[PDB]
Structure formats: structure tokens, C-alpha cells
Design an enzyme around this catalytic site. Sequence first.
Site, PDB file in Angstrom:
ATOM      1  N   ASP A 197       7.069  13.466  12.704  1.00  0.00           N
ATOM      2  CA  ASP A 197       6.820  13.190  11.271  1.00  0.00           C
ATOM      3  C   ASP A 197       5.369  13.473  10.925  1.00  0.00           C
ATOM      4  O   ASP A 197       4.742  12.705  10.209  1.00  0.00           O
ATOM      5  CB  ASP A 197       7.185  11.739  10.926  1.00  0.00           C
ATOM      6  CG  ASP A 197       7.374  11.504   9.422  1.00  0.00           C
ATOM      7  OD1 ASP A 197       7.450  12.457   8.609  1.00  0.00           O
ATOM      8  OD2 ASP A 197       7.444  10.326   9.051  1.00  0.00           O
TER       9      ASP A 197
ATOM     10  N   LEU B 142       0.807  -1.218   0.000  1.00  0.00           N
ATOM     11  CA  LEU B 142       0.000   0.000   0.000  1.00  0.00           C
ATOM     12  C   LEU B 142       0.841   1.271   0.000  1.00  0.00           C
ATOM     13  O   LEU B 142       0.311   2.352  -0.243  1.00  0.00           O
ATOM     14  CB  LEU B 142      -0.922   0.025   1.218  1.00  0.00           C
ATOM     15  CG  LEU B 142      -1.871  -1.162   1.390  1.00  0.00           C
ATOM     16  CD1 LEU B 142      -2.699  -0.987   2.651  1.00  0.00           C
ATOM     17  CD2 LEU B 142      -2.767  -1.338   0.175  1.00  0.00           C
ATOM     18  N   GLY B 143       2.136   1.146   0.290  1.00  0.00           N
ATOM     19  CA  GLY B 143       3.027   2.297   0.434  1.00  0.00           C
ATOM     20  C   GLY B 143       4.065   2.035   1.506  1.00  0.00           C
ATOM     21  O   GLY B 143       4.100   0.951   2.099  1.00  0.00           O
ATOM     22  N   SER B 144       4.896   3.040   1.765  1.00  0.00           N
ATOM     23  CA  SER B 144       6.021   2.911   2.693  1.00  0.00           C
ATOM     24  C   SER B 144       5.968   3.967   3.790  1.00  0.00           C
ATOM     25  O   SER B 144       5.574   5.103   3.546  1.00  0.00           O
ATOM     26  CB  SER B 144       7.345   3.022   1.931  1.00  0.00           C
ATOM     27  OG  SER B 144       8.437   2.603   2.738  1.00  0.00           O
ATOM     28  N   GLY B 145       6.361   3.564   4.997  1.00  0.00           N
ATOM     29  CA  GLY B 145       6.526   4.457   6.145  1.00  0.00           C
ATOM     30  C   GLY B 145       7.980   4.420   6.570  1.00  0.00           C
ATOM     31  O   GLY B 145       8.816   3.839   5.871  1.00  0.00           O
TER      32      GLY B 145
ATOM     33  N   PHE C 103      10.094   2.861   8.551  1.00  0.00           N
ATOM     34  CA  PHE C 103      10.934   1.653   8.708  1.00  0.00           C
ATOM     35  C   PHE C 103      10.419   0.409   8.008  1.00  0.00           C
ATOM     36  O   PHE C 103      10.891  -0.703   8.267  1.00  0.00           O
ATOM     37  CB  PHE C 103      11.142   1.357  10.197  1.00  0.00           C
ATOM     38  CG  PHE C 103      11.864   2.450  10.923  1.00  0.00           C
ATOM     39  CD1 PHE C 103      13.077   2.928  10.441  1.00  0.00           C
ATOM     40  CD2 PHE C 103      11.330   3.021  12.065  1.00  0.00           C
ATOM     41  CE1 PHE C 103      13.751   3.946  11.087  1.00  0.00           C
ATOM     42  CE2 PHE C 103      12.000   4.042  12.716  1.00  0.00           C
ATOM     43  CZ  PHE C 103      13.212   4.505  12.232  1.00  0.00           C
ATOM     44  N   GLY C 104       9.483   0.589   7.090  1.00  0.00           N
ATOM     45  CA  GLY C 104       8.924  -0.547   6.424  1.00  0.00           C
ATOM     46  C   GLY C 104       7.939  -0.188   5.358  1.00  0.00           C
ATOM     47  O   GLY C 104       7.865   0.954   4.887  1.00  0.00           O
ATOM     48  N   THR C 105       7.171  -1.206   5.014  1.00  0.00           N
ATOM     49  CA  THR C 105       6.341  -1.235   3.843  1.00  0.00           C
ATOM     50  C   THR C 105       5.015  -1.789   4.321  1.00  0.00           C
ATOM     51  O   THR C 105       4.967  -2.869   4.916  1.00  0.00           O
ATOM     52  CB  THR C 105       7.004  -2.137   2.781  1.00  0.00           C
ATOM     53  OG1 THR C 105       7.922  -1.352   2.010  1.00  0.00           O
ATOM     54  CG2 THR C 105       5.985  -2.792   1.850  1.00  0.00           C
ATOM     55  N   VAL C 106       3.946  -1.045   4.067  1.00  0.00           N
ATOM     56  CA  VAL C 106       2.641  -1.378   4.606  1.00  0.00           C
ATOM     57  C   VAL C 106       1.879  -2.234   3.598  1.00  0.00           C
ATOM     58  O   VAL C 106       1.831  -1.903   2.410  1.00  0.00           O
ATOM     59  CB  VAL C 106       1.860  -0.107   4.991  1.00  0.00           C
ATOM     60  CG1 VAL C 106       0.454  -0.457   5.468  1.00  0.00           C
ATOM     61  CG2 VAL C 106       2.623   0.636   6.077  1.00  0.00           C
TER      62      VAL C 106
HETATM   63  C1  LIG Z   1      -6.076   3.680  -1.112  1.00  0.00           C
HETATM   64  N1  LIG Z   1      -4.871   3.619  -0.236  1.00  0.00           N
HETATM   65  N2  LIG Z   1      -3.737   3.978  -0.552  1.00  0.00           N
HETATM   66  C2  LIG Z   1      -2.901   3.781   0.469  1.00  0.00           C
HETATM   67  C3  LIG Z   1      -3.614   3.265   1.459  1.00  0.00           C
HETATM   68  C4  LIG Z   1      -3.291   2.902   2.689  1.00  0.00           C
HETATM   69  C5  LIG Z   1      -4.110   2.496   3.801  1.00  0.00           C
HETATM   70  N3  LIG Z   1      -2.935   2.200   4.360  1.00  0.00           N
HETATM   71  C6  LIG Z   1      -2.189   2.451   5.425  1.00  0.00           C
HETATM   72  N4  LIG Z   1      -1.015   2.815   4.924  1.00  0.00           N
HETATM   73  C7  LIG Z   1       0.074   3.076   5.600  1.00  0.00           C
HETATM   74  N5  LIG Z   1       1.103   3.521   4.849  1.00  0.00           N
HETATM   75  C8  LIG Z   1       1.059   3.519   3.350  1.00  0.00           C
HETATM   76  C9  LIG Z   1       0.848   4.866   2.894  1.00  0.00           C
HETATM   77  C10 LIG Z   1       1.868   5.854   3.557  1.00  0.00           C
HETATM   78  O1  LIG Z   1       1.481   7.197   3.188  1.00  0.00           O
HETATM   79  C11 LIG Z   1       1.897   5.788   5.058  1.00  0.00           C
HETATM   80  C12 LIG Z   1       2.211   4.317   5.391  1.00  0.00           C
HETATM   81  N6  LIG Z   1       0.019   2.902   6.934  1.00  0.00           N
HETATM   82  C13 LIG Z   1      -1.127   2.468   7.530  1.00  0.00           C
HETATM   83  C14 LIG Z   1      -2.302   2.178   6.791  1.00  0.00           C
HETATM   84  C15 LIG Z   1      -3.422   1.755   7.497  1.00  0.00           C
HETATM   85  O2  LIG Z   1      -4.483   1.499   6.957  1.00  0.00           O
HETATM   86  N7  LIG Z   1      -3.361   1.615   8.892  1.00  0.00           N
HETATM   87  C16 LIG Z   1      -2.260   1.876   9.574  1.00  0.00           C
HETATM   88  C17 LIG Z   1      -1.115   2.313   8.915  1.00  0.00           C
HETATM   89  C18 LIG Z   1      -5.314   2.242   3.103  1.00  0.00           C
HETATM   90  C19 LIG Z   1      -5.710   2.684   1.849  1.00  0.00           C
HETATM   91  C20 LIG Z   1      -4.833   3.166   1.012  1.00  0.00           C
END
Ligand SMILES: Cn1ncc2cc(Nc3nc(N4CCC(O)CC4)nc4c3C(=O)N=CC4)ccc21
Length: 266
Positions: A126, A14-17, A19-22
Site C-alpha cells: 500500500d 486525523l484520517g483513515s488507514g 483498518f481504522g481511524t487515526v
Molecule cells: C495535518 N494532518 N493531517 C493529517 C495528519 C496526520 C498525522 N497523522 C497520521 N495519520 C495517519 N493517518 C491519517 C491520514 C492518512 O492519510 C493515513 C492514516 N497515520 C499516522 C499519523 C501519524 O502521525 N503517525 C502514524 C500514523 C499528522 C498530521 C496530519
Amino acid sequence: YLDRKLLTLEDKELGSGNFGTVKKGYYQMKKVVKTVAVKILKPALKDELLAEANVMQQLDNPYIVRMIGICEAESWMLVMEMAELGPLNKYLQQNRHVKDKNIIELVHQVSMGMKYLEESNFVHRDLAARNVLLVTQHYAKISDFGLSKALRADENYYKAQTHGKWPVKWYAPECINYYKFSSKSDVWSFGVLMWEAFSYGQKPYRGMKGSEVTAMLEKGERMGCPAGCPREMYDLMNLCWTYDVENRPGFAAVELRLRNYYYDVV
Ligand SMILES: Cn1ncc2cc(Nc3nc(N4CCC(O)CC4)nc4c3C(=O)N=CC4)ccc21
């Protein structure tokens, strides 16, 4: 702690923060499955994720992403609730129809989230529109405590030893100049986050190097008021961007102005 077997992961990231990759996933609780977002670790780093989890474990507020728990299998993993709509800056980019009063609601929620964090004596470090996550179009939560610090009971700032690669465009002068991070420097970041929100997810200081942004601020120059941004919201941005740390408001005063302004506009 959390068991790998009861955790399923989708394989698109879904993307990166910090220290990792979500990645999206599903975690089976007693009876139901919880949809989850899972930060998965790319020597030291394990400690960093664990530290982030240690921060998250002590936070309980409606406007902060909840951690489900930690998981240690294949990789080290930090399991969080899923905010389905994703990051604020992307959502607003793709949803330019979102109303000015909708954006106020959401930034006000972040300021409630941040007021709690200030009362709890944690520094985010951040704070940016990319790390505000939307559960619903009217429900925002703050995430990514990878850079966050628990302040000492006798101090109101964390002093970093060095400058590792930093989100300089979201940092107050005193962080850049002196490596001093306080709730007041999260307030500076919040102002830049406000600018982001009311510019529908446009990047701040477009095309400038960190060094040029710093030089611009030390001239007393600031970013302009975004198209259609209510004047009282733009005034609060400039207040957040007070150069002197002591005169810059704390989150109690920031949340109060957001709260009064939001409640005033029905
Ligand atoms: C349509 N879309 N695009 C990215 C995306 C991400 C969420 N994703 C989430 N994504 C991240 N990251 C990916 C995007 C970065 O800007 C920040 C780190 N972190 C979290 C969630 C989450 O749901 N809960 C806790 C942490 C859910 C929907 C998303």
C-alpha cells in the site's frame, strides 16, 4: 503492553488507514509525555491490527514510522509516534512552494525506507503518497503496514487469495493479473508515489476507473511527466513502471539512482 490510563486522546480524527481511524493523543512515559498518533479499530479485524503491529514491531529504520506499542481498552489500539506535518500528498497540496530538490530529498528517504523493507523481505502492498508521513519538511517516514506481509524465506512474492478492495492505481500489472506482490511491485507503487510527489499531491489517473488504468498500462501507456519535474526523476518513474517484473528494478537500484541524483544536485 500499553496502559489506557496513561493514554489521552483528542477526539477529532486525523484520517483513515486500512483498518481504522487515526487520532491524535498523548501518552505519558516515565517522565515526559509522548505525543502520539493512535489507530483505533472500527469478527476478524482485531487480528488484522494485531498483525500490523506484529509487522511494525520487527521494523527499525529511520524512515519507517515507529510503533510505541499496542493498547486494548474501549477499542483495540495501535499507538504510534506522531508525524506532525501529516501525509505527503496533503502537505504538498497545501505547500506548492516546496522546491523540486526538497521533493527529491523526501522521495529518496522513502526509497531508503523501502530498501530496508526489501532487505528485510517484507512487502508493503500500500505504498502511496498518503502513507508517507512528514515528521519535518525534510524528514519523511513510511506508515500503514495494514496490507504488509513477511515473505517466506524460500519465496520473493506473497500471493493473495482473491482480490479484496485494493488501491489499484498504485498496483503493478502482476498484482492485478496474478495477485503476486513482491518488492518489485512495491517499486511500481513507488513510481506512482514519485508521480504524486512531483505533481504536488494530485491523484494519479484522475477520473479513471481501476479497470481503465489497467487497460491503459497494457497498451504500454503511462502517466505524463509532471510540471517542473526534473527529467532524471521522470525517467526513474518510467523505469519503476516497467511492465516485466524481472526487468523492473529492485529498491537497491532505485535508491542508488535517487541517491546519486540527489547528491549531484547541490
Ligand atoms: C495535518 N494532518 N493531517 C493529517 C495528519 C496526520 C498525522 N497523522 C497520521 N495519520 C495517519 N493517518 C491519517 C491520514 C492518512 O492519510 C493515513 C492514516 N497515520 C499516522 C499519523 C501519524 O502521525 N503517525 C502514524 C500514523 C499528522 C498530521 C496530519
